[PDB]
Symmetry: C2
Subunit: 139 residues, 2 copies
Amino acid sequence: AQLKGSKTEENLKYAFAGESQANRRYLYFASKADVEGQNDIAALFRSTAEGETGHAHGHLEYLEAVGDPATGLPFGTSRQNLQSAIAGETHEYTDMYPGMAKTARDEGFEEIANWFETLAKAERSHANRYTKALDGLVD
Amino acid sequence: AQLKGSKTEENLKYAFAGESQANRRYLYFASKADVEGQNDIAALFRSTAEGETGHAHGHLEYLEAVGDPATGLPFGTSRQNLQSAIAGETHEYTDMYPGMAKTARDEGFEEIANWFETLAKAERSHANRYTKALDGLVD
Ligand SMILES: [Co+2]
Ligand SMILES: [Co+2]
Ligand SMILES: [Co+2]
Ligand SMILES: [Co+2]
C-alpha cells in the first residue's frame, strides 16, 4: 500500500488543514475569553489547542512520506524545510496574496485589499529571511 | 459591498487555512531544527510562525462578519465560540475521523486507521469537555 495517490493521503492533508485551523481558532477564542474575564474558558481553549497541535503534527509526520502539504516538496531536515518554506512563501507573495488583493479591490473591499497587500509584503520579507538563513546553513 | 457570497470571502477562508497550516508547519520545522542543533534556524521558524499567527487572526477578524470558517456559525463571544467549537468537534468525532479511519483500513493503512480512531476518541473528549464548559458559563 503506497500512500502517494491514495484517498488516505488526501484525508491526512484535509485533517492537517483542519487541525491547524482548529488550533488557530481556539487561540483566537481564548483571547476573546481573556478580555471577557472568562479565564477558565480561555485556559480550556488553550489546553484543547495543544491537543490539536499534537494532532496536526501527527498528521504531518505521516505526510513526510509524500511531501509538504503546502508545496509538494520534501521535508524533514532543516535544509529541506527551509527550501520548502521559501518556495511556499514565494508563491504567497508572487501569486496568492497579490491575486487576492486584486479581487478584493475589484469587489469593493478596499481595506481587505490593503490587508492582503500588507501580507504579500510580509511573506516576501519572510521568504527573503529564510533564504538568508539557508545561505548560512552549515549542516 | 457585502462580504457574504463574495470571492473575497472565499479568499479569506483559503488564506486563513493557509496561514493556520504555515504556523503548524513552521513549528514542526522548528522542532526538527531543535533536534539537529540548528538553534538559530529553530528561532527563525518560531519568529516567523508568530507572524503567521498574526496573519491568521487578522483573517479571522474579517471573517467575524460572515461566520466561523469551520461551521458557518457566528463567533466572537465565549458563548458563541464554545458553541461553534462543539459543533465542529461533533462533526469530527461522529463523521470525519471515523470515515477517514474506514478509508485508511480499506486501503491497507492499519496504523493510520488506528491513528484516525485515536483522534475520533480525542475529539469526542474535546467536544464533551467544551459542552461541560458551556453549561457552566456565566456571562
Ligand atoms: Co484535533
Ligand atoms: Co510567511
Ligand atoms: Co503569513
Ligand atoms: Co479537538
